[PDB]
Amino acid sequence: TTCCPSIVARSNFNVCRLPGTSEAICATYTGCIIIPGATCPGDYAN
């Protein structure tokens, strides 16, 4: 599951993914994170 720290970070993450870039690279690029669970924390609410 991916979690993003802000709305812009999520929007940037979604553009990063369009060419098929791995989630892990889009995470470090945007500040979003990958977690094994499904429940994002309050500081990664977007």
CA separation for the pair 16, 39 (Å, rounded): 22
DSSP states of 1-46 as a string? Answer: -EE-SSHHHHHHHHHHHTTT--HHHHHHHHS-EE-SSS---GGG--
Q: How many CA atoms lie within 13 A of 35 on its CB side?
A: 11
Cα–Cα distances (Å) from 15 to 34, 36, 37, in that order, read 16, 22, 23
Tokens of 14: 């979604």
Tokens of 28: 């470090």
CATH number where 12 lies:
3.30.1350.10
Strands 33-34 and 2-3: antiparallel
Q: Structurally, how many domains does the chain consist of?
A: 1
Q: How was this structure determined?
A: X-ray
Domain span holding position 45: 1-46
Determine contact, residues 21/32, Cβ cutoff 8 Å. Answer: no
Determine contact, residues 33/6, Cβ cutoff 8 Å. Answer: no
